From a paper:
Although the nematode E4 complex preserves the ring shape of the human enzyme, it displays notable adaptations, particularly in the dimerization interfaces that result in different topologies of the ring-shaped arena. The functional importance of the ring architecture is emphasized by its conserved shape and dimension in CeUBR4, despite pronounced differences in its helical scaffold and dimerization interfaces.
Aside from teaming up with various ubiquitin ligases, [name] activity is linked to two specific cofactors: calcium-binding protein calmodulin (CALM1) and [name] (13, 16, 17, 20, 21). Our data show that the evolutionarily conserved [name] complex forms a megadalton E4 arena, in which inward-facing ZZ-DZB domains of [name] act not as E3 ligases but as substrate receptors.
Numbering used by the authors: 657 to 883, 891 to 1187, 1306 to 1396, 1416 to 1510, 1520 to 1771, 1933 to 2337, 2349 to 2358, 2372 to 2401, ...
Amino acid sequence: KIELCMKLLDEFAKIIAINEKSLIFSLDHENILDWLEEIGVLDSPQITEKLVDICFSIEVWDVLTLLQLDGPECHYWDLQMFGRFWKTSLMDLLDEKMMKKVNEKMGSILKEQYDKQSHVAKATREKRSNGKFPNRPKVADWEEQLLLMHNRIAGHLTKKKVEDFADESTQKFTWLLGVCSGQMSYKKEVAVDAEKILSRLYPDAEKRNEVLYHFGVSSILKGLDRPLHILFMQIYLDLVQIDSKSWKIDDSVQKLSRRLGGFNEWLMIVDEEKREDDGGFRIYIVLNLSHYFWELLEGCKASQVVDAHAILKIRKFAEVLASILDKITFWPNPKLHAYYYIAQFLEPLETIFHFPEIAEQNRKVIESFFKQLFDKLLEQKYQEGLLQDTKLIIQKTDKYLSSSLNLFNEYNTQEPSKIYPVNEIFSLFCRYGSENVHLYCLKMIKKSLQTLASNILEHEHILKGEVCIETELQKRLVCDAVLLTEFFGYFSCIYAQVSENQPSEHDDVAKAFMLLDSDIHLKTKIRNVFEHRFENLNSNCCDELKSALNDVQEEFKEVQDDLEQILEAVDFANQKALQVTEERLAVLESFNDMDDVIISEKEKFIEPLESGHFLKIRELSDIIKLDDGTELLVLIPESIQTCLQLHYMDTRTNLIQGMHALRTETEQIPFNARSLHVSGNRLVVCGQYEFFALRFSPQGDVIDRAHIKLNNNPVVRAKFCREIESDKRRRQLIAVATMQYIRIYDLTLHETNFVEEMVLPAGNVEDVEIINQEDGNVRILVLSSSGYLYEHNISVFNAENNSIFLTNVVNTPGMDMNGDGVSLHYSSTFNLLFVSLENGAFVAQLPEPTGNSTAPIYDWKHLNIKNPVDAWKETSGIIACLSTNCNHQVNYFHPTVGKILLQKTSVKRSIMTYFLMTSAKNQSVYSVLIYPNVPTCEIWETSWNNVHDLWIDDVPTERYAVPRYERQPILTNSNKLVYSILEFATLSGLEWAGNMAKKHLSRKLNHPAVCSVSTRAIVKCHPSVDEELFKIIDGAYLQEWKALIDWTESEGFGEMRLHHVEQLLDRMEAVRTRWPYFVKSLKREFGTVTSFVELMRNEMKRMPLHRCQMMAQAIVKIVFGLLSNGTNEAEQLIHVFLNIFTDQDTYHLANDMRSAVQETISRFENALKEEKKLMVEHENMDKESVLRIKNYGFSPFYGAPRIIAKTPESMLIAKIAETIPIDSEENFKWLEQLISMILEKLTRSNSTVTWQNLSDSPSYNLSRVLASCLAICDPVIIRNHFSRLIHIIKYDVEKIFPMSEKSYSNYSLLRSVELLLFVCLEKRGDESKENQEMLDSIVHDLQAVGIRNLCLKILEKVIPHWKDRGPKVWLPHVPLVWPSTSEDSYIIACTDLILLIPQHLQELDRRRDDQWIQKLCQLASLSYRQCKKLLLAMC
C-alpha cells in the first residue's frame, strides 16, 4: 500500500506542477496529513521525500501563479530556480540600477510571450490580473487551500531534532536551505522554525551565511544546464561583481570557488554527455568574468597611483583562474566556433601573467594547458566541425575563381568575425609559452608536415584557379593552407629567437648594390610579415631546442617536391588571373543574338555595407578620380543654390576612415544649379535657361570654365561626349537638350556658336545620348514624347548655325504600345542601349551605321520591368538606375554571358541622391546613397561572397604602413603560403631556395615580400660576388622590360601597366653600381643598345602627355651614361636620340625632352661641385681614404659623385667598376660628337614647315639643348664650336627673309647664335685668363663677321610690314599651370631675334649710328620694352 501512496503523491505533484484541474482539489486536501494518519503510515521515512517533492511542486506552482504566465511552456527546473531567485536574502545585496534592469527585461520577455499567445486565455488573464509585475494578481479560493495545506506540511517536518537533517546530500536538506532564507510561499512561522533547525545544525553564523550564499549561487548555476538564460547570466555576473568587493587578501582558492558557486566541481565534470549539446555556458561565464576583470586591470594600468583594492580583486581572480586553467580546455564545442574562443582565451592568460608569482607557482598547469590547446589544432573532429560550420565561407571572384582562399571580411559585423584565427593562437603560444611548449609544438609540426603538404596537393587543380569550391570536402584545402603557413612562420620566428649569427656580409652586398626595393627608396625599422614576441623563454637551455629545429630541417628534404609543385600551381594561378581578354570578348559577343538571352533575378549581387554620418531631378552628385588615387565628390547643396560643393576624400587606405576625414571646398557658380553631369574629368551644370561647364586639373584644381546663355524652351538635359585616348584630336563636344531642339557645342571651336541644332517635328524631347565613334563621326539618339527614337550622325564639323529636321526613325520598342519616353542610356563597355518608357524598359545592341538616308533595324528585349526609370549611372561592369514613380527603390543590372542579372532593392527611407564608384582598393564596387537626415549616407557594396569584378582593371591594392606609406598589392593567403615556404627554405636548404627563387622574380606577378625573399635567397646562395649573380638579377629586370611589347591595349589592364612602368623607371637607378655588367646584359638580351633605346622611345608615346617627363629623363640619363662611358654604337645611338625630336610621330614631345636635358645637366653640376669640395678636404688627408670610380655608369647624372669614401661596400663596388687616380681630369669627346651632330642636324633639317607657336618647334628645342650642353664644356671647346657655327651662316638678306628653304635654316642658326651668346653672357663673372681670351676672341670674330649690318638689313624689311598690316576657346588638352597668320608670327619672331642679338652683343662687349637709332625709335612708335631697353643701353 505504501507504493500506492508513493504513486498518488507523485501524480499529485506532477499534476499540480502543470496547473491542471483534477478532482483531488474538490476533496478536503487541506488536512492531507490527517489522511496519512488514518492508515498510520505517517511514520514512514520514505514518504517524506515525496512530501518535500510535493512542497517543491507547490512552490513552482506559486511562482507560476505570481508570474501571471500559466501553461507548461517552461520546464520545471527553470521556474524552480526562478523561485529561488526571488526576495530571498540573495537579493538583499543587489542595488537599484540592476533591479530596474532586470524588472525591465523580464517585463519585456513576459510581454513578448503574452502577445505570442491567442485571444481567449488573453481575456482570461486580463480579467484575472488586477495589475502588472510585481503586483500579485487577484486571489481565488483554491490557491488558499493549496497554501494552507502547504503551511500545514510543517507538522510532519519535525522529524526528531537534528538527526534526520544531518545528511547534507538529501533533497530534504535542499528544501530546508530553501525555506530558511527567503521562499515567499512559506509563512513566517515556518521560516522561524527553519531558522531554528539551521541554528541547531550550524551553531555559528559565519558558516551559516556561507552555506546559504553558496547554495543560492549553486542553484543559479545548476539551473543553467538544460535549456531568460541571458538575464540569469547577467545577474550572475552582477552578483559576482558585487561580492568581489568583500574578498580578503588571505582567502584560499577553495573558499573563493565556494563563493562563486560550485565552480571547481562544475568545471571539472569532463564527460561525453556534458560536452554533447551544451551551449558552451561554462566558457561563456569564464570569458565574461575574465573580460570584466581584464578591463578593470587595464584601466588600473594607466593610472598614476595603484589602488590596493583593485589589485587585490585582480589577484584573487587570477589565483582562481590559475587553479582552474587545466579544466576549461575540454569545454569548447567542436561543432560551434571552437577556434574563436580558443583565440579569445588571450585575456585570462594576460591577467594571470600580470603577476609573476602566480605564473611561477603554476608552471605545469600552464604548460599542459598550452599542450592541449595545440593538440586541438590537429584533431580530426575539430577540423571536420569547423569545415561543416555555416559561418566559414570562402570568397569567390570572377578573375580569381577561388585561388585567393580568402575567408575574412573586414566589414562583417557578426560575432564570429575571425572564425579561424590560427595566427592569434600561435602569437599567444609565442608570447606566453615556455620551452616545453615549444618543444612539443616543434615535434608535432615535424610529424604533420608531410600529411599537410599531401592534403594541400590533393586540390592542386583548384589551387590553380580553374574551378571554384563547392563541397565541404574541398573547403579542407583552406583549412590546410593557412595552417601550413602558420607552422612555417612559427618555425622562422623561434629560429630568430634562439640562433644568433648575423653574418652581415649578405646584408652588406644587398646594401652596397641596392638590390632591395625598400633600401632603394630609403637611399634615394622594417616590419616583417610574421611578428611574434617571446616573454617566457630562458636562454640557458638553448641546446636541446636547436636539436628539435635540426630535426624539422631534415624533414624539409622529404617534402620539397610537393612544395615545389604547389609553388608552381600558385604561380600558374597568379599568371592566369591577369588574362581577361577572352572572357570579355565572349561576354560582348554573346549579346549578338537576342534569342539566347534571359534576365535572372535569382542572384543577390549587391548587399548593404554600412550606414554612416559623414557629409524632380535626382542627378545632384557625382565623382571624379584623381591621378594619385584620391577622389573628388561634386554635389549641389540645398541651403545655397549659387555654389558647388567639392569634397576630397582619401579612401585608398580605408573606406570608412577615408570618408570620415573629408576636405570641404566651395566653388562659386553664377546661377542656381538644377542638374549635374560628369564625364571623365569635366562637368556640366544645368540651370534654368543657361548652363555652365567646368574642366579640372589632374591635381583636382579647377582650370577651365565656360558659361553659355541660350515660346518656351528651358534646359532639360545636357551631357558631354565620351573621350577616347586613341583620338589625338580631343573635341569637347557637349549636347544640350531643350523641349524643342538639340544643340551641340564644341568648346574647341566656338563658345557661343553651336556646331549643329536639330528640331523635333511634332514632339517633345525627353533624353538625348551622344556616342563618339572610332571613325570620327558622332552618333546621337533622341527620345521624343510619343516614344519615337530618332538617330542622327554627324561627319562634318563647322561652327556654323545649322538647323535640321529629324527624319530618321528606328523601329520603336513595344510596337503599337509605346507610352511616353522617359530615359535613354548607352553602355559603352557592353555596347548596349537601354530605353525606358512609361510601360516598361527595353534593351538592344547598337547596330553598325548604314547611312544618313536609311534607318537601321533594332532587335529589342524586354528587361522584365514595367515602372518607368529615369536616372542612370554606370561603373565597372555595373549599371544602376532609379525608378521615378517610387522614392525608395533602385535597380541594378549586370550583363553576363547570355544573361542580364537584375536586382531590385528597396530602402525604408526616401532617397535624395546616389552615386556609383569603383573602390580605391580596386576590389569591389560601392554605391553611396545620400539622405537629408542625421544618418546622412548609406553605402552598399558588391557582395563579398561572390564579387563580380571581370571589368575592374587593377589588382587589389592598399597603402600599407611600412609614418611611411607605400602602395602595395594585397597579400592573399596563397602568396603568404608561398612566402612562408620560401623563407623556410632559405633557412633550411639553401641550394633549393636559390634554385626556386630564380623563378619568382617578376614584380608584376609576385608580391613585394616574395620578391624580396627571393633576392635575399639568391644573394645568400652566391657568397663570392661575380658576374653570375648580377647576370641573373639583371636578366630578370631586362625580361620585365622586354615583356612590355606584348602588353598591347586589347590585353586589358591599363592602370596596372602604368604603375608597373613607373616601378620599372624607379628601379632603373640601382644599375649605376654595376655598369659594365648591365651593359653586357643589355647586349646579350636586346642585341644592340639602340634596340633598348628604341623600346624606351616606343613606350614613351603610350604614356599620358602629362606624365611622360619621368621617362624622358630616364632616356636622357641612359643615353648620356652610355656616351660618357664609351660605346661602339655612339653614332647610331645619338642618331636615334636626335631623330626623336624631329620625327613625325614624336616631334610634339620635343618640348619635353629639352626640359629633361635641362634637368640632367643641373644634376651633373650637383655632382661636380660636390666632388671638387672633396678634392679640397682630401688635400690635407691620407690618400687611402677615398676612391674615384672610372666606370660610374650614369652616377653623376643622378647627383651621386664619383668620389666615395673607402669603406667595405665601396671596396665591393670598386672591385667591379674599377678605379683611377683621383686627381684625373675630365674628357668630353662624347659631348663634342653630340654637339657636332646636333649642328649638322640643324643645318640639314628640312625647312618651310609653318608653325603657329615657335617656342614648341623642334628646332628651337634643339638649339636650346645645344646651348645647355655648351654651358659646361671647356672654354677652348666653346671657342672652337662657336667659330665653326659662325662660318656656316649665310648673310644674304633677300635669300633668307620671306619664305625660302634656306630662310628657315638660317633663322634656326641665327637663333642658335643668340642662345649661345645668352649662355656666354653669364660667364663674365669668371675671371680666368682663358675665359677672357675666349670672350675677346668671340667678340672680335663677331665684329669682323659683322652681323649688326645684317640686323639693320633685316629690320629695314621688318618695319614696313608692321606699319602696313600690324596694329577664349578651350585647348584640346588641359592647360598645365595680333599676330593673325603664320607670316605675321614669323615676322614677330624675326623682329624678336634680330633685336635680341645686338643687345647681347652690346652687353657682352664691355670694352651711335644714325640708321640704328632712327629704325629703333620708329619701330618703337609702331609697336616694345625691348626697343626701350635697347635705346637706353645705347644712351
